[PDB]
Amino acid sequence: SEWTERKTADGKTYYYNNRTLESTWEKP
């Protein structure tokens, strides 16, 4: 488990990063 791919009710799969505390919306 490296990146959190979770679906927010907005209909978006947001990649939230709690490892370094960063919000990523574009997959590296």
* 2/28 Cα distance (integer angstroms): 12
Structural biology method used? NMR
* 22/5 Cα distance (integer angstroms): 13
User: Cα 14 from chain centroid?
Assistant: 4
Residue 14: beta bridge partners? 6
Of residues 11, 14, 15, the one with CA closest to residue 3:
15
- Map out the domains of the chain with their CATH numbers: 1-28 (2.20.70)
User: Cα 19 from chain centroid?
Assistant: 11
Of residues 7, 17, 12, the one with CA closest to residue 28:
17
Residue 23 is classified by DSSP as: E
Count of helix runs (H) and strand runs (E) in the chain: 0, 3
Residue 17 · residue 3 · CB < 8 Å? yes
